Swiss-Prot record:
Disulfide-bonded cysteines: none
One cellular component (GO) term of this entry: cytoplasm
GO molecular function, one term: damaged DNA binding
Record lineage: Archaea, Thermoproteota, Thermoprotei, Sulfolobales, Sulfolobaceae
PROSITE patterns referenced in this protein's UniProt entry, alphabetically: UMUC
Site residues, Substrate discrimination: 12
Protein name listed in UniProt: DNA polymerase IV
């Protein structure tokens, strides 16, 4: 199995530089505020070094990057670029898994006839084409599985091209630092380091229960398997980017007879702006005081539109059997986990 992981380098910030060449070089920082009140969404490296990162309040960033160029967030533009690149990637693989607006996995075990050396060749052409047609740098990782593809990709960005051949696998995992593993909090890593866990292999030298009471069943199994490479999940041909259409009722109430008709229209519109069957459906109800109140359900197989109406109605019922004295002002639907192709 040959997996190619493609990650757009500080995407949101890099696009603004493509639309404003002059900014190229200076500490750019994509902001996300409203109402002041906001935070840092993205920032190129010329701004990262100055101590600016995502999640960091605009103020704290401004106080550490005054000369930094701050620009509001125009997601519709990023979305546009994202769609263009993702579809460009779709033709280069047997299966494509859109992890986010800037992350994707590709199984090319067939396009390269099972030749791992050609997967690197392809990942070279991919990295090239994106740069040509879109003027954007992406970091790529080429390894037997997703986790390895992503890990090597991080240790290689920006503009990098990480590679882990089938033979250098078990080796790579050994000298792999806990702090380089995705899914582990920077906090849980510090504690692990304090406990003597420096490399991923140090996990294969400690009572599992003694490891769970620190990490937890989830991450413990993940780390233990990862230290053996038994964490080789196939590349699902789907998209994890949410999509949902909301609608405002002719007047806010709790009358299912009035709400439902609109809930079904929201479902129809949500299905039109989607390229496949959703594996999860979430009914969102914007209540009189504008606060959100939702509930959803995930399915193995795809969820047909006719099933959507049924499932959605029950979800709507429940929300109403969970909140009283609160007419619904708006009602929408949010579809996720789309089974593409």
């Amino acid at each position: 199995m040959i997996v190619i992981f493609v990650d757009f380098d500080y995407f949101f910030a890099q696009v603004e530089e493509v639309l404003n060449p002059q900014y190229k070089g200076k500490p750019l920082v994509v902001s996300v505020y409203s109402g002041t009140s906001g935070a840092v969404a993205t920032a190129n490296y010329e701004a990262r070094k100055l101590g600016v990162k995502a999640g960091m309040p605009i103020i704290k960033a401004m106080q550490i990057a005054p000369s930094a160029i701050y620009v509001p967030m125009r997601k519709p533009i990023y979305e546009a670029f994202s769609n263009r690149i993702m579809n460009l990637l779709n033709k280069h693989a047997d299966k494509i898994e859109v992890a986010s607006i800037d992350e994707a996995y590709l199984d090319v075990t067939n396009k390269v006839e099972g030749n791992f050396e050609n997967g690197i060749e392809l990942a070279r052409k991919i990295k090239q084409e994106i740069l040509e047609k879109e003027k954007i740098t992406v970091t790529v990782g080429v390894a037997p599985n997703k986790i390895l593809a992503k890990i090597i990709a991080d240790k290689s960005k920006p503009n990098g091209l990480g590679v882990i051949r089938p033979t250098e696998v078990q080796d790579f995992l050994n000298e792999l630092d806990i702090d380089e593993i995705p899914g582990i909090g920077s906090v849980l890593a510090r504690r692990l380091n304090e406990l003597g866990i420096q490399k991923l292999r140090d996990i294969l030298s400690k009572n599992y229960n003694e490891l769970e009471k620190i990490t937890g069943k989830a991450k413990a199994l993940y780390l233990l398997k990862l230290a053996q490479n038994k964490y080789s999940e196939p590349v699902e041909n789907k998209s994890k980017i949410p999509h949902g259409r909301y609608l405002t009722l002719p007047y806010n109430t709790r009358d299912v007879k009035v709400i439902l008709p609109y809930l079904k229209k929201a479902i129809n519109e949500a299905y039109n702006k989607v390229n496949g069957i959703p594996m999860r459906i979430t009914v969102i109800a914007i209540m009189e005081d504008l606060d959100i109140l939702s509930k959803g359900k995930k399915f193995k197989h795809g969820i047909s539109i006719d099933n959507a109406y049924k499932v959605a109605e029950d979800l709507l019922r429940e929300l109403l059997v969970r909140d009283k004295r609160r007419n619904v002002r708006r009602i929408g639907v949010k579809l996720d986990n789309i089974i593409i192709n």
